Design a protein around this ligand. Structure first.
Ligand SMILES: Nc1ncnc2c1ncn2[C@@H]1O[C@H](COP(=O)(O)OP(=O)(O)OP(=O)(O)O)[C@@H](O)[C@H]1O
Ligand SMILES: Nc1ncnc2c1ncn2[C@@H]1O[C@H](COP(=O)(O)OP(=O)(O)O)[C@@H](O)[C@H]1O
Ligand SMILES: [Mg+2]
Ligand SMILES: [Mg+2]
Lengths: 310, 485, 310
């Protein structure tokens, strides 16, 4: 069923439907545009109207413009064909190498692993760094946090950990460029082609790239962390492989949330942050974990505003 | 019976409901697009920011106190854009692209949107060509590559702007020459400054014959906050013209601190939730999307580039503040300037410990790498020793005075390495610190006059060979002996 | 055109009009009052109604009381007849020496000199004082920050700069008393008469006083600098002189702007200051410059709050 755009303001867009109102999470395709603009339904305002969040720039949108319902959340490719490729927030390839051909298509939104599905292994991971291994060593299939201010050395540290651990590893790896420098994605991409972990000719790539960098709008940066997360979950659940997840920077997920929160019509929390800071991070973070079947090891770079850990 | 007037149908036009707090609420404009430019009855421009069900909130690019209620707003049709081309060179303009120098109309052919998204991963490629500032302390210690983003940051009156000015004056070497690849078109964006300061700035560039390859966007303190907010993006689009058409360009946002407070004004008047220092949540996104557009394009996409030099003003040297840390986490290196060094007379005052540029290091000449390889760490260790090792102080005082440089006088890369070679290799150890400045002037004027072949071989090869090293060794050695007594 | 008062909340006063809705910045004459009450229009609330800031006490105002539009901003007396006289924010004399018999009138609000009018050359203003000229010299069309209060010959220095600029450069001066003690205004007024820079007998006075002290409302105090500025703009633009504009002090201009912004209900900025801090200062300080016709050099006193320059 078609729907008309009633109001637009930044990333947030209100769409009205006559019949067949779409539920929360569902992606909506906007008509009369060159690039595929996807609106994700966040709230139900009432009077057959829904408040959405755009995954790309909303410039050019007019009131009364048509909006079709896909009938499901944002679906993306998942499988071995995603390895050695670069995906955006809504699943499209952004490396000029045709479509990503896959049988399965996972939705970016999903419930967290249940209590019975959780694992409890605590084997040490030898990184090679003296300060880490001695004082605060990482665990295999564990959640690793790299807190740091502006220009202290998180990207250097996470590249080292990829250089040390990801090369000496049997399973696959997944990098998620969340709201960081775009040239670093270019530096990383060509460096991985140089080393051999990403093979262009063969179908034996060990890394899957996902990018929604700081040039993208907030809606993209708010949902790209879930997109790259879903790619790693496929290998964990269906295949049962030991995955090495890498996010840089996970703060940009929460930072993007505050920008849209203002426009979503919520009462602001402490330091201008969104009131749903814990739950939005909770639903996202809880998915990143080692289940009984598979395993995910996440090294997350964390930005610290104004060198304030509080 | 005459037909009714349908000139003000609410489809393509609309009347103002209210106006006061920066925003203009407009009744009508049903077919208008989001972020579309709109024209008011008093010849004033505006942007359709808020599209609500019963009205359209418009950001007024200019004095909103001219607009009244019931005034007719009209659609331009296109998304907020600015004039673009080589016709802007040697012209001073406002954020909209209108000439303010009184030299007639621009006469531009092409136009580009202000809010275009930056190039993705594929069009980009690591920086290769060096962006020569012509400043010894910069080009040696903190070199900038073409396509790089390098933050100039420090307290008020520390010489932030002077680095950008000398960088623009230095490009005359390449632009008045045969090599089209080495040319660099400059764009100085002024945000929140005084008009007198900008008028003095363009005259200085005019006297140095630097304006004819320079565009000047001006949004001074008296101009409305939206014009200051827009000014960087307009100039950025003018830089992208060169970038996309296989040409290299430089852009200087002076400064993004004064842009941030302008955007904070708009957001606080919009009644949006404030955070750190009353700034909104998207002050990072404000500067991120701007700076990302500065990039190095590969040969497939023209092979051009856009180099960004954003400026930031810190209060009492607080680099850990909210806005500095945001711009530090965007750019590919920093150039921090200190009040202490600037007060002593060490100009340009650059903090060698804090200032870095790893991306620009790759795009540096091999000649400069040889003479200024160890110099980075030597100057850092020199500042540590506050209270064999005495020789470190004997070198540190010389290299600091050697890196000192006068204003409005850049140097060629081959001319710089010759001066740095003298101090770093240890041919100015037995000499008074005060004699270092006069030695440089006498030495530089000698080598540029007599030894052109030596300087030419250094530039052409981009390296100090064994024959050039031995030749250069015997100039500084014998010239010193005469200079001493 | 005539209007009617619809609301009164402190200094803020709403006025509804039938046909002619007055533009922003325009002065409105309130009818049926003993002394002259001026309202300056700030916003257009809609439905033929405008919000205004009072230049004096709003006591005695009734909902429905008539208000006339002057057709322009706060116009004031400007000319050689302002020299030796004291005037308030709205141009009325407050020295009990009869009316200010002026020839021309000038609005307090004015656009800053355009880019083409700017003087590209930086010339020095010879003060005649050795400490100033040598070490920290004054620039024509510049703005100098005077620091310190009593016990250091502050008023004597001010009177000398008035005398020396008038003696050497042939330029008159203006003293804008912004938000300080009315006691101090009385002290200076008589010291200037004692020195000779003001003369009550003949027309050889070198200063035009424009006072709006802390006894007056925030609406008045915010517009006093502009009133004194406009007096200085006459001698530059019409007579082609190197004018000397004193502001005592610039902090009170900033404080008044913060108070007016607060009373309107605008969400405050950092450290409780107004969102329009840079623009309010910018629009005033940019008018103080060198031009083709002349210049205005300004010596502005500064109170640094909490001894904090940041
Ligand atoms: N290398 C130098 N040698 C001597 N004087 C210099 C040098 N660089 C700058 N100056 C002088 O120092 C003053 C301040 O420099 P500049 O305006 O570039 O700093 P700034 O950080 O841009 O100041 P602001 O941010 O307040 O504009 C200038 O008036 C200039 O004349
Ligand atoms: N292991 C290291 N050794 C030396 N320098 C480092 C190291 N890690 C970081 N740095 C310095 O810190 C700078 C910024 O590093 P980066 O990882 O980009 O920080 P951030 O992730 O906070 O932006 C680099 O330019 C580099 O000079
Ligand atoms: Mg980083
Ligand atoms: Mg400056």
């Amino acid at each position: 069923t078609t729907g008309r755009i009633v109001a637009v303001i930044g990333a947030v867009v209100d769409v009205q439907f006559d019949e067949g109102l779409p539920p929360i999470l569902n992606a909506l395709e906007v008509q009369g545009r060159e690039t595929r603009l996807v609106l994700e339904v966040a709230q139900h305002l009432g009077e057959s109207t829904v408040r959405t969040i755009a995954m790309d720039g909303t410039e050019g949108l007019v009131r009364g413009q048509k909006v079709l319902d896909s009938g499901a959340p944002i679906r993306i490719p998942v499988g071995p064909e995603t390895l050695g490729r670069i995906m955006n927030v809504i699943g499209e390839p952004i490396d000029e190498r045709g479509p990503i051909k896959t049988k399965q298509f996972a939705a970016i939104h999903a419930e967290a692993p249940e209590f019975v599905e959780m694992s409890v292994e605590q084997e040490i991971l030898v990184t090679g760094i003296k300060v880490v291994d001695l004082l605060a060593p990482y665990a295999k299939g564990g959640k690793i946090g790299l807190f740091g201010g502006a220009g202290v050395g998180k990207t250097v540290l996470i590249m080292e950990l990829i250089n040390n651990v990801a090369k000496a590893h049997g399973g696959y790896s997944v990098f998620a460029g969340v709201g960081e420098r775009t040239r670093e994605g270019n530096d990383l991409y060509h460096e991985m082609i140089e080393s051999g972990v990403i093979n262009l000719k063969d179908a034996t790539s060990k890394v899957a790239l996902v990018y929604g960098q700081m040039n993208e709008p907030p809606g993209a940066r708010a949902r790209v962390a879930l997109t790259g997360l879903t790619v790693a979950e496929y290998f964990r659940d269906q295949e049962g492989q030991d995955v090495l997840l890498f996010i840089d920077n996970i703060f940009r997920f929460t930072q993007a949330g505050s920008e849209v929160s203002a426009l979503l019509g919520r009462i602001p929390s402490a330091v201008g942050y969104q009131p749903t800071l814990a739950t939005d991070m909770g639903t996202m973070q809880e998915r990143i974990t080692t289940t009984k079947k598979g395993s995910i090891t996440s090294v997350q770079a964390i930005y610290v505003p104004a060198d304030d850990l509080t | 019976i005459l037909g009714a007037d349908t000139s003000v149908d609410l489809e393509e036009t609309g009347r103002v409901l209210s106006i006061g707090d920066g925003i203009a609420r407009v009744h009508g404009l049903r077919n208008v697009q989001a972020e579309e430019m709109v024209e008011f009855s008093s010849g004033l421009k505006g942007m359709s920011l808020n599209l609500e069900p019963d009205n359209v909130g418009v950001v007024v690019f200019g004095n909103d106190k001219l607009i009244k209620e019931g005034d007719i707003v009209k659609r331009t049709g296109a998304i907020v854009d600015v004039p673009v081309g080589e016709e802007l060179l040697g012209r001073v303009v406002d954020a909209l692209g209108n000439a303010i120098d009184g030299k007639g109309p621009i006469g531009s052919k092409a136009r580009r949107r202000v809010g275009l998204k930056a190039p993705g991963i594929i069009p980009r490629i690591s920086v290769r060509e060096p962006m020569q500032t012509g400043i010894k302390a910069v080009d040696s210690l903190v070199p900038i590559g073409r396509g790089q983003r390098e933050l100039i940051i420090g307290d008020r009156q520390t010489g932030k702007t002077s680095i950008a000015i000398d960088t623009i004056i230095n490009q005359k070497r390449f632009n008045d020459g045969t090599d089209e690849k080495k040319k660099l078109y400059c764009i100085y964006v002024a945000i929140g400054q005084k008009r007198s300061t900008v008028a003095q700035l363009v005259k200085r560039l005019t006297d140095a014959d630097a304006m004819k390859y320079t565009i000047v966007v001006s949004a001074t303190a008296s101009d409305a906050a939206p014009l200051q907010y827009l000014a960087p993006y307009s100039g950025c689009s003018m830089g992208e013209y060169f970038r996309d058409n296989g040409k290299h360009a430089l852009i200087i946002y002076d400064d993004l601190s004064k842009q941030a407070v302008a955007y904070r004004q708009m957001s606080l008047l919009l009644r949006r939730p404030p955070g750190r220092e009353a700034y909104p949540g998207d002050v990072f996104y404000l500067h991120s999307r701007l700076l990302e557009r500065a990039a190095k394009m590969n040969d497939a996409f023209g092979g051009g580039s856009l180099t960004a030099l954003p400026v930031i003003e810190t209060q009492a040297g607080d680099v850990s503040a909210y806005i500095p840390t945001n711009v530090i986490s965007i750019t590919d290196g920093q150039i921090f300037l200190e009040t202490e060094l600037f007060y002593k007379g060490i100009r340009p005052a650059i903090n060698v410990g804090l200032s870095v540029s790893r991306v620009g290091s790759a795009a540096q000449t091999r000649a400069m790498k040889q003479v200024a390889g160890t110099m980075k760490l030597e100057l850092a260790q020199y500042r540590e020793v506050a209270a064999a090792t005495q020789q470190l102080l004997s070198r540190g005082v010389r290299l600091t005075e050697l890196l000192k440089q006068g204003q409005y006088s850049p140097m060629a890369i081959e001319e710089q390495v010759a001066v740095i070679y003298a101090g770093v290799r240890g041919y100015l150890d037995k000499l008074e610190p005060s004699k270092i400045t006069k030695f440089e002037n006498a030495f530089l004027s000698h080598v540029i006059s007599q030894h052109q072949a030596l300087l030419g071989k250094i530039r052409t090869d981009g390296k100090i060979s064994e024959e050039s090293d031995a030749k250069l060794k015997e100039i500084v050695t014998n010239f010193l002996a005469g200079f001493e007594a």
